[PDB]
Amino acid sequence: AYDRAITVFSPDGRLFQVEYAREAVKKGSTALGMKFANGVLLISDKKVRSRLIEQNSIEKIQLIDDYVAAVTSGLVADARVLVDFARISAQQEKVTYGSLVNIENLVKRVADQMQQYTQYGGVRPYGVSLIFAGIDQIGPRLFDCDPAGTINEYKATAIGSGKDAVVSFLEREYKENLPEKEAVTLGIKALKSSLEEGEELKAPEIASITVGNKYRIYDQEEVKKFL
Amino acid sequence: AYDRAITVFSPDGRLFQVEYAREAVKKGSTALGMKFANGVLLISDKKVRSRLIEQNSIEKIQLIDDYVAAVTSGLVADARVLVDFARISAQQEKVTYGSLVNIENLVKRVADQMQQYTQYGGVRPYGVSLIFAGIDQIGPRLFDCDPAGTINEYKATAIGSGKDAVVSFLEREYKENLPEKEAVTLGIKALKSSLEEGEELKAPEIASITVGNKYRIYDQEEVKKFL
Amino acid sequence: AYDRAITVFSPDGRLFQVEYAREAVKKGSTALGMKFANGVLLISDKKVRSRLIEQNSIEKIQLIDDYVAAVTSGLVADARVLVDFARISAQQEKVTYGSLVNIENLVKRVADQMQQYTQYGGVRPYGVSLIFAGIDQIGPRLFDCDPAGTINEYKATAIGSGKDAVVSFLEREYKENLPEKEAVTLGIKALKSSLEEGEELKAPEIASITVGNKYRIYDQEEVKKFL
Amino acid sequence: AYDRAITVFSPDGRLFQVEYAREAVKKGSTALGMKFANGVLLISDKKVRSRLIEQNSIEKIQLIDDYVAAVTSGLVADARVLVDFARISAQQEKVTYGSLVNIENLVKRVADQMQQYTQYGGVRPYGVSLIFAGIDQIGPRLFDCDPAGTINEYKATAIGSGKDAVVSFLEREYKENLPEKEAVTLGIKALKSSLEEGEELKAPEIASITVGNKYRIYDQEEVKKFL
Amino acid sequence: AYDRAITVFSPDGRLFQVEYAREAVKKGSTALGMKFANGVLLISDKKVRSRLIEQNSIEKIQLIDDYVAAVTSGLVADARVLVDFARISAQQEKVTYGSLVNIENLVKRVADQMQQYTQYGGVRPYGVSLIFAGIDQIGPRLFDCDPAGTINEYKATAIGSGKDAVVSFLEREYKENLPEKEAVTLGIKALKSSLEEGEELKAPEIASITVGNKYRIYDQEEVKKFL
Amino acid sequence: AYDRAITVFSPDGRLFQVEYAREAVKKGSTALGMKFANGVLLISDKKVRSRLIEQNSIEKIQLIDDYVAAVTSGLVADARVLVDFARISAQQEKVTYGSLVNIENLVKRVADQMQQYTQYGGVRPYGVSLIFAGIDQIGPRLFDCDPAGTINEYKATAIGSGKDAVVSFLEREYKENLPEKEAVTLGIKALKSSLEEGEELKAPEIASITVGNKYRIYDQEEVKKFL
Amino acid sequence: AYDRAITVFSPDGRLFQVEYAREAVKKGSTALGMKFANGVLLISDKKVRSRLIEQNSIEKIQLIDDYVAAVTSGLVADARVLVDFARISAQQEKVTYGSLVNIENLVKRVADQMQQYTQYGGVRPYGVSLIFAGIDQIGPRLFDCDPAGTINEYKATAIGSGKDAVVSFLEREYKENLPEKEAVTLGIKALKSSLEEGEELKAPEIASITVGNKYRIYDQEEVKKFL
Amino acid sequence: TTTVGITLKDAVIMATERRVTMENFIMHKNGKKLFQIDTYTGMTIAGLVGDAQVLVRYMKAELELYRLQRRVNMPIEAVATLLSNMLNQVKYMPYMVQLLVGGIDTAPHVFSIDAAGGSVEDIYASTGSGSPFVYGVLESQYSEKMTVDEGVDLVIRAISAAKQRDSASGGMIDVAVITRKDGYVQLPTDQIESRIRKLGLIL
Amino acid sequence: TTTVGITLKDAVIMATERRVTMENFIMHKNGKKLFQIDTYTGMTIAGLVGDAQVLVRYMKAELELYRLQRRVNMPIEAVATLLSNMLNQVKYMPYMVQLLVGGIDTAPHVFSIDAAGGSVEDIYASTGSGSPFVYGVLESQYSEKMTVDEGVDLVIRAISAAKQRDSASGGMIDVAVITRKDGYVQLPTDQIESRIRKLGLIL
């Protein structure tokens, strides 16, 4: 009887509505990423859909800069509004400081925006989690921003329906500073071990950066190698 | 007990109210479109009504520019308010950039507008889906904007009550770069295979563009050829 | 349990509150109109009331210009507020463009106004339908604007409690370009065939325009001819 | 279950809350008026109360100008706020046009004010009806403004608990252009035939205007003549 | 089920919430006043309380000017906020017109303020009634302002728990133009006949004005005379 | 069913939500004060808590000026917000009039602030009562401001859980103009007779002013004398 | 039935919604601090999590200045928004007074911010408690700010799930002015005696200041000494 | 114009002249520049007529609201501080007025407030165009040991010298002595004519 | 006008003159330009009278609210920074005032704040029209090794030279020495007359 408003706590002190937005994230497809020896990558599962769909607009990974990128999971409408806000806040940070100096308060802009809607009535939260990754003045970054707004810097994570299984794998297998290829294949094995029995891993979009370089997205045949 | 407000999620994490606006779209008549060798078209089913109605104002297809056009399905009141907002946003984009440079953020204006109402209480969403199509600096475009706001670039789609059957047909029959006539007849067969048994396909409005040309709507006797 | 708020859809995806405003229209008396050879007319049934009432203020037909006019059905309070907004919007259109150039966006002003109240909570819709008719730069116009805001250009229509029976008659009897008198008598027969058995058609107000002329309302003895 | 909000229609399409404000009018005492040969009058029943009350402040009839006057029935608080708004709107009308040119849009100001509160939530309507009467550039005027806002020009009416019986009498007895005295005595008979058995008509306040003259209120002994 | 909001009428057409504020007035102690030969007085019952209370701040009678004064009954919080608003409005009237010219629209300021809160949701009315009394350009004034805002000019009244019994006494005993002393003793007898059996009338605060003079409050031993 | 909103009266005309804020005051510890021969004091019971607590911040008595001071009882959050508003209001009074001339409208500001929240929905009242005390241009002052806002000038009072027993004692024992020491010991006996059996009065904070002097708080060993 | 809104008191006069935010604090991990001979420290328990997490962003202790620091417990989203507001208010205090002169009204800014949301509907409180600690012009400070906003200056405290057990230990063991090392080991024993049986205290973050020095955080191997 | 306010032992005496111009062109031979602002204090007027009358209405309003709410008269430093705050809250659309409030609360005071809101006590003050003449005669003849009659004679001699030497000053002098015992009393015009005929200042 | 503020070993001495003009026309022979702004710091006034008094009221207000909330006196750099922020938040409708705050918190300070809000410490400062004369005598005679009596004698000699050489300066000098031990104490006028008669600055 308390899980109807965003502004009401429970006898334990729980915000169920925020947790239900977190459950809305859980119905999205798995997407992971980690940092390595000079740079970070991102991997995103895609169960291949309608060939009528232009493949340019089903990419869960999106470039918020030449030097920051992210991936979502959850509601597709809120997902796109969020990656839009990430882009616009990147441009505002870049115009007030000359450059995107640190990725951290780009994600703070996004995080405070997502947090505010978990507090006021007449508004629902965003049912999307976002994983940011890039290179700044400091180096490789990797965050995740959840519906409540909570951000945390990681060395590896996932989001989506697999997230527990992927972070369970990486929790006992990941070793830092892998050269890019070895890192990617570890992350592919991580993504593999989150599916159910009988499911074959289709082709996932994967993209990376190294320190001093720009972005690149591995095209489907460079992806096809690690199947 | 959660499908009463636009701002409440569910134990799965579902926004039922948004889904019921999507159900309100489903009660509208089928309208499809695809791109081809230098251009895009749109096809819209119309079960022919009262001859007292001036045919000029039952056209589901509407010109938002000489170089962008769209078609709706759902609530007719919200439908007209939406095609109005599409026109006004086309004019604002055209006055700030000198020309409608790319169709994408015209549809972003419309998409952000439709998304915002799926988030704040005291407002209901639009019960309409829109399919945009035209030529830009890039070339043939084809989008669909749903009640939640979600836009996707396609090579072929439908909306309305048939949508699943038409995308099911085009999902196994559509081949790109058809010369305009062959494309239209494929889309007519697509529209045919979405009706129920006994129903005869009446005359549907169909319109197209090619690269470097303006709009034209096939009049009823050029339409009458492909029956 | 969903027909209590203006902002909640149903498991089919229906807006019942809007439909109940449309039901409130249905309790008003029948009023019809059609265009003909150079011009349009309007006919409005009036069950004759108290002779204490000054007849100047029970006219369902109202002049919004010398060259646009309309008729209502539904709530009399909302009806008068609406014909006021139609007049004020006609004056605003006339001051920004020098003349009421086309009737269509006068009715767009009225339609957007009536639509907006079908979307925001804390506001109820207008329970009135309006039939506009006049001469513009294009020629004879004839619209109907319903509670949801939906406008459609017709060649003949009705509103009110008879509307289905009158449009049923006109749907099988109306032929365009009748000379004014023959048109009026067809519309009188249309209005006659919507009453119930035993009811005698009293004297209805009828008015018309021809291209290049102003308005005139047939007085009661010119009306008395076609009884 | 629908008669709780001002903004909800019913399966018939009824606004019960507005109808209950109209029921609140019905609990007020009867007040009538009519126009005659060059002028209009007003009659108002008063069941004589506490002699401690200064008679100056129980007058249901109130001068909104030297040349417009009115009478109320319903809630006494809303009644006084309404006659205040009528006075202030008369002054605003008189300052923007040099004079109260027509009584009609004084009553339009009052009517639009009373109508607006029958539409927005968080506001209740006025539970008062008002009968305006005066001389303008046109001549004798006589209106009634109800809780929903609906105004109508009459030649005779009443409001209050008797209203049906008085308009029933006047509907079969009133003849226009009576010389003032004969008109008043007809209206007194009208007011008489609305009481219940055993009730003796006490002294009612009655006031009138003729064309070119100002207001006057018949004092109690000029009233005492027609008992 | 309708007496929960300030903005909902009943099947009779009653505003119960306003009537319950009027019931909140009824819980306050009796206070009366009347005008006489050149001036007005006020009498207020006080069941004598804690001798720790400074007697300066339990006076139900309060000076709103040297030439207007009043007395309350009901909620003490709302009562004090109201006598504050009466004082501030007296000062605003005095600064815009040079002097408090007539007491009537001081009480109109207070009345419109108290009325407004009987109309908007999210606000409760004032549970206080006020009796104003003083000398103006016209002479002796005596009003009562109730929770709904309704003001009436009297020659004698009361408010509070006794109000019916006191106005019942004055309704059959009061004779105007009594010399001040005789008036006071009549009002004391009025106040006496409203108590219950066994209750002894303690010392009530009483104050008066005559035309051309200022205020004075009878001190406790001038009061003690009429016991 | 009426004690859920701050804006709803009851069939008696009671504001229960205000009364429940008054009940929230009753859960706070007892604090008393009285005026005497040239000055006022305040006494406040404190059941001695954690020695980890800096004693500087558990003082229920607080200096709002060198010449006004107060003590609270109720919610500690609202209590501190209130003593902050008292301080800021003292500073505003002191800057607009050069000095805190009279304590009374410092307490009027606090009173009006606390009253306003007992009237509007979407706001709860303050669950705190405050006892002000000091020296002004007039002399010794002593007020109490309750949740509804009601202020009263006293010669002695208490607030908190004992309040009835302490005012019961002072109601039959207090004699004015005691020399400071004798007054304090009377107030200590008052505070003693409000505890329950077995409870030993610990050390209470006590502070005073005399006319022409500033504040002082008796330290714990000057307090320890009167045990 | 009263624990659903932030603005409703109870038959005792309790604000349950505030208490449930206080319960939401109780689900966070224990964090303590105390002052000593020239300075203050803070200790915070951390059950060691995923080695994929960058340890820089799981620190419950956060530097709000070089000379003020704090630690949270409760909702992680609200926790971060709060430490952000503490930082921004420290900067505003530092720019208006040249330096953070006293820690107390930094915590007043944070406290008033947290209190305000316990009073207005449509907003929920913060489910976080904060412990501030630093050096000012006065010396070692140590506060705790709870969800209702209540601040208190201590010499030792905790927050979180252990809080009662830790303050129970410190309530019978803490002695002031310990040299830093001895103080830390006392606080470690305090933190140890709050766990459950079988749980081994992992490595907790601990940080301190002395008068005239800046901040330092003991790194994990200086922490590892006191295990 | 010329106003004067003199504080002596247990009384404070204020007087103005009565001539309003409003043009060059002396237009009103009988104005009103001395106002009773509360039961024990008054205010004089030496600036723009409209702004000054609005200031008098606001100060009568706030001091009567004060006496009604708190049931005690406002102190003289408090009313002059309030008047300074009012004149200084709007100084870039300012009131072109020179004020002089005087009264008695526990000691007789007279304060002088300029158009920017600077209030400062003095034992005698004066505002107006004919101010330096009354400052000359007050500097030469004023004594703090005077009685009320010697004070009001000094005041009449002062305003008479200002009327003789200044164009904007003129008309019949109205004088009002405010003391604690008798309250604010304004001398009748026949008594002021008697003092002028006694002092030999009539021609 | 002339004000002065001198910092020595364990005390800070401030003094003003007392003459207000407000016109050319010296109008008030006994003003008040030296204000006790908190229990251990004071403020002098050398600008527009109304704006300056409003600044004094606001600073008394904020520093008393400070001492009440935090139970410690505000530092001198903190009050001068607050005063600078107030004077610089509104500089295109500015306060035409030259301020000089001085006091002791752990060391004696005197700061000088202009009309645009620029605060800067100095060991001795002065504001006003007669400021360069007291800067001359302070530059020639000031020593940081002085006692409180030699400091207040230097201050009186300074303001006396400014009164002798400046028209807007004059009246009786009021001096207030603020030290940590005795707090803010203002010297009585008989003691200041005694110092003037001792130093030979009376005529």
Side-chain angles (χ1 to χ4, degrees), chain H residues 30-44:
Chain H
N30 192 1
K32 183 173 175 65
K33 296 180 183 293
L34 176 58
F35 293 97
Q36 183 178 0
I37 214 75
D38 199 0
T39 61
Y40 288 103
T41 173
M43 185 185 288
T44 70

PDB file of all heavy atoms in Angstrom, chain H residues 30-44:
ATOM      1  N   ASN H  30      -2.371  79.731   3.201  1.00  0.00           N
ATOM      2  CA  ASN H  30      -2.622  78.994   4.429  1.00  0.00           C
ATOM      3  C   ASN H  30      -2.499  77.505   4.142  1.00  0.00           C
ATOM      4  O   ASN H  30      -3.486  76.850   3.798  1.00  0.00           O
ATOM      5  CB  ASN H  30      -4.009  79.339   4.974  1.00  0.00           C
ATOM      6  CG  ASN H  30      -4.236  78.838   6.389  1.00  0.00           C
ATOM      7  OD1 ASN H  30      -3.360  78.235   7.000  1.00  0.00           O
ATOM      8  ND2 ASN H  30      -5.429  79.089   6.913  1.00  0.00           N
ATOM      9  N   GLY H  31      -1.296  76.963   4.287  1.00  0.00           N
ATOM     10  CA  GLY H  31      -1.064  75.547   4.121  1.00  0.00           C
ATOM     11  C   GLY H  31      -1.118  74.825   5.448  1.00  0.00           C
ATOM     12  O   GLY H  31      -1.598  75.341   6.457  1.00  0.00           O
ATOM     13  N   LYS H  32      -0.627  73.594   5.436  1.00  0.00           N
ATOM     14  CA  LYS H  32      -0.470  72.818   6.655  1.00  0.00           C
ATOM     15  C   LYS H  32       0.805  72.005   6.558  1.00  0.00           C
ATOM     16  O   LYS H  32       0.872  71.022   5.816  1.00  0.00           O
ATOM     17  CB  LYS H  32      -1.658  71.893   6.906  1.00  0.00           C
ATOM     18  CG  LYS H  32      -1.554  71.130   8.212  1.00  0.00           C
ATOM     19  CD  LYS H  32      -2.815  70.347   8.510  1.00  0.00           C
ATOM     20  CE  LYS H  32      -2.645  69.505   9.757  1.00  0.00           C
ATOM     21  NZ  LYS H  32      -2.455  70.352  10.961  1.00  0.00           N
ATOM     22  N   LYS H  33       1.816  72.425   7.309  1.00  0.00           N
ATOM     23  CA  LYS H  33       3.102  71.743   7.301  1.00  0.00           C
ATOM     24  C   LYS H  33       3.448  71.075   8.617  1.00  0.00           C
ATOM     25  O   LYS H  33       4.425  70.325   8.659  1.00  0.00           O
ATOM     26  CB  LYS H  33       4.214  72.723   6.931  1.00  0.00           C
ATOM     27  CG  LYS H  33       4.089  73.275   5.530  1.00  0.00           C
ATOM     28  CD  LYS H  33       5.205  74.246   5.219  1.00  0.00           C
ATOM     29  CE  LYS H  33       5.028  74.851   3.847  1.00  0.00           C
ATOM     30  NZ  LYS H  33       5.204  73.831   2.782  1.00  0.00           N
ATOM     31  N   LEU H  34       2.699  71.311   9.686  1.00  0.00           N
ATOM     32  CA  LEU H  34       2.938  70.697  10.982  1.00  0.00           C
ATOM     33  C   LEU H  34       1.823  69.708  11.278  1.00  0.00           C
ATOM     34  O   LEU H  34       0.650  70.087  11.323  1.00  0.00           O
ATOM     35  CB  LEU H  34       3.019  71.770  12.067  1.00  0.00           C
ATOM     36  CG  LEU H  34       3.182  71.356  13.522  1.00  0.00           C
ATOM     37  CD1 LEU H  34       4.412  70.523  13.715  1.00  0.00           C
ATOM     38  CD2 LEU H  34       3.271  72.600  14.359  1.00  0.00           C
ATOM     39  N   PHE H  35       2.192  68.447  11.480  1.00  0.00           N
ATOM     40  CA  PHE H  35       1.232  67.363  11.601  1.00  0.00           C
ATOM     41  C   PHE H  35       1.431  66.632  12.913  1.00  0.00           C
ATOM     42  O   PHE H  35       2.564  66.348  13.303  1.00  0.00           O
ATOM     43  CB  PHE H  35       1.379  66.363  10.458  1.00  0.00           C
ATOM     44  CG  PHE H  35       1.015  66.917   9.125  1.00  0.00           C
ATOM     45  CD1 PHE H  35       1.992  67.394   8.272  1.00  0.00           C
ATOM     46  CD2 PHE H  35      -0.301  66.963   8.721  1.00  0.00           C
ATOM     47  CE1 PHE H  35       1.658  67.899   7.039  1.00  0.00           C
ATOM     48  CE2 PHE H  35      -0.641  67.469   7.492  1.00  0.00           C
ATOM     49  CZ  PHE H  35       0.343  67.938   6.650  1.00  0.00           C
ATOM     50  N   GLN H  36       0.331  66.318  13.584  1.00  0.00           N
ATOM     51  CA  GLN H  36       0.380  65.429  14.731  1.00  0.00           C
ATOM     52  C   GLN H  36       0.425  63.986  14.261  1.00  0.00           C
ATOM     53  O   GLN H  36      -0.553  63.461  13.726  1.00  0.00           O
ATOM     54  CB  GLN H  36      -0.830  65.635  15.632  1.00  0.00           C
ATOM     55  CG  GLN H  36      -0.784  64.787  16.868  1.00  0.00           C
ATOM     56  CD  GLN H  36      -1.961  65.014  17.782  1.00  0.00           C
ATOM     57  OE1 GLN H  36      -2.842  65.822  17.492  1.00  0.00           O
ATOM     58  NE2 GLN H  36      -1.965  64.329  18.912  1.00  0.00           N
ATOM     59  N   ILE H  37       1.566  63.339  14.473  1.00  0.00           N
ATOM     60  CA  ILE H  37       1.819  62.026  13.896  1.00  0.00           C
ATOM     61  C   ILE H  37       1.483  60.892  14.859  1.00  0.00           C
ATOM     62  O   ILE H  37       1.289  59.756  14.405  1.00  0.00           O
ATOM     63  CB  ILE H  37       3.281  61.914  13.398  1.00  0.00           C
ATOM     64  CG1 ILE H  37       3.385  61.038  12.164  1.00  0.00           C
ATOM     65  CG2 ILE H  37       4.210  61.356  14.438  1.00  0.00           C
ATOM     66  CD1 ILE H  37       2.885  61.729  10.937  1.00  0.00           C
ATOM     67  N   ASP H  38       1.361  61.170  16.160  1.00  0.00           N
ATOM     68  CA  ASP H  38       0.934  60.234  17.197  1.00  0.00           C
ATOM     69  C   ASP H  38       0.553  61.090  18.398  1.00  0.00           C
ATOM     70  O   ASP H  38       0.680  62.314  18.350  1.00  0.00           O
ATOM     71  CB  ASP H  38       2.035  59.223  17.546  1.00  0.00           C
ATOM     72  CG  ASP H  38       1.506  57.984  18.249  1.00  0.00           C
ATOM     73  OD1 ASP H  38       0.281  57.908  18.467  1.00  0.00           O
ATOM     74  OD2 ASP H  38       2.314  57.094  18.594  1.00  0.00           O
ATOM     75  N   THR H  39       0.095  60.448  19.476  1.00  0.00           N
ATOM     76  CA  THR H  39      -0.409  61.190  20.629  1.00  0.00           C
ATOM     77  C   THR H  39       0.674  61.959  21.371  1.00  0.00           C
ATOM     78  O   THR H  39       0.343  62.894  22.105  1.00  0.00           O
ATOM     79  CB  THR H  39      -1.107  60.257  21.616  1.00  0.00           C
ATOM     80  OG1 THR H  39      -0.174  59.284  22.096  1.00  0.00           O
ATOM     81  CG2 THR H  39      -2.276  59.554  20.947  1.00  0.00           C
ATOM     82  N   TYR H  40       1.950  61.596  21.208  1.00  0.00           N
ATOM     83  CA  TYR H  40       2.995  62.375  21.860  1.00  0.00           C
ATOM     84  C   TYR H  40       4.148  62.763  20.938  1.00  0.00           C
ATOM     85  O   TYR H  40       5.244  63.033  21.440  1.00  0.00           O
ATOM     86  CB  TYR H  40       3.580  61.644  23.069  1.00  0.00           C
ATOM     87  CG  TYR H  40       2.652  61.578  24.254  1.00  0.00           C
ATOM     88  CD1 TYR H  40       1.966  60.412  24.555  1.00  0.00           C
ATOM     89  CD2 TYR H  40       2.476  62.678  25.081  1.00  0.00           C
ATOM     90  CE1 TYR H  40       1.123  60.345  25.635  1.00  0.00           C
ATOM     91  CE2 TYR H  40       1.632  62.620  26.165  1.00  0.00           C
ATOM     92  CZ  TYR H  40       0.959  61.449  26.436  1.00  0.00           C
ATOM     93  OH  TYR H  40       0.116  61.377  27.516  1.00  0.00           O
ATOM     94  N   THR H  41       3.943  62.813  19.625  1.00  0.00           N
ATOM     95  CA  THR H  41       4.992  63.246  18.717  1.00  0.00           C
ATOM     96  C   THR H  41       4.387  63.832  17.452  1.00  0.00           C
ATOM     97  O   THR H  41       3.281  63.464  17.055  1.00  0.00           O
ATOM     98  CB  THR H  41       5.953  62.103  18.377  1.00  0.00           C
ATOM     99  OG1 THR H  41       6.875  62.525  17.364  1.00  0.00           O
ATOM    100  CG2 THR H  41       5.240  60.872  17.953  1.00  0.00           C
ATOM    101  N   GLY H  42       5.123  64.755  16.832  1.00  0.00           N
ATOM    102  CA  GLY H  42       4.662  65.413  15.633  1.00  0.00           C
ATOM    103  C   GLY H  42       5.753  65.458  14.582  1.00  0.00           C
ATOM    104  O   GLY H  42       6.901  65.106  14.832  1.00  0.00           O
ATOM    105  N   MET H  43       5.370  65.916  13.394  1.00  0.00           N
ATOM    106  CA  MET H  43       6.247  65.919  12.232  1.00  0.00           C
ATOM    107  C   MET H  43       6.052  67.223  11.475  1.00  0.00           C
ATOM    108  O   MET H  43       4.923  67.692  11.338  1.00  0.00           O
ATOM    109  CB  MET H  43       5.940  64.726  11.322  1.00  0.00           C
ATOM    110  CG  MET H  43       6.868  64.568  10.136  1.00  0.00           C
ATOM    111  SD  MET H  43       6.371  63.241   9.025  1.00  0.00           S
ATOM    112  CE  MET H  43       6.778  61.820  10.016  1.00  0.00           C
ATOM    113  N   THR H  44       7.144  67.811  10.987  1.00  0.00           N
ATOM    114  CA  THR H  44       7.060  68.997  10.146  1.00  0.00           C
ATOM    115  C   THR H  44       7.425  68.643   8.713  1.00  0.00           C
ATOM    116  O   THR H  44       7.987  67.577   8.450  1.00  0.00           O
ATOM    117  CB  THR H  44       7.972  70.121  10.624  1.00  0.00           C
ATOM    118  OG1 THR H  44       9.333  69.758  10.391  1.00  0.00           O
ATOM    119  CG2 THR H  44       7.769  70.381  12.095  1.00  0.00           C
TER     120      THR H  44
END
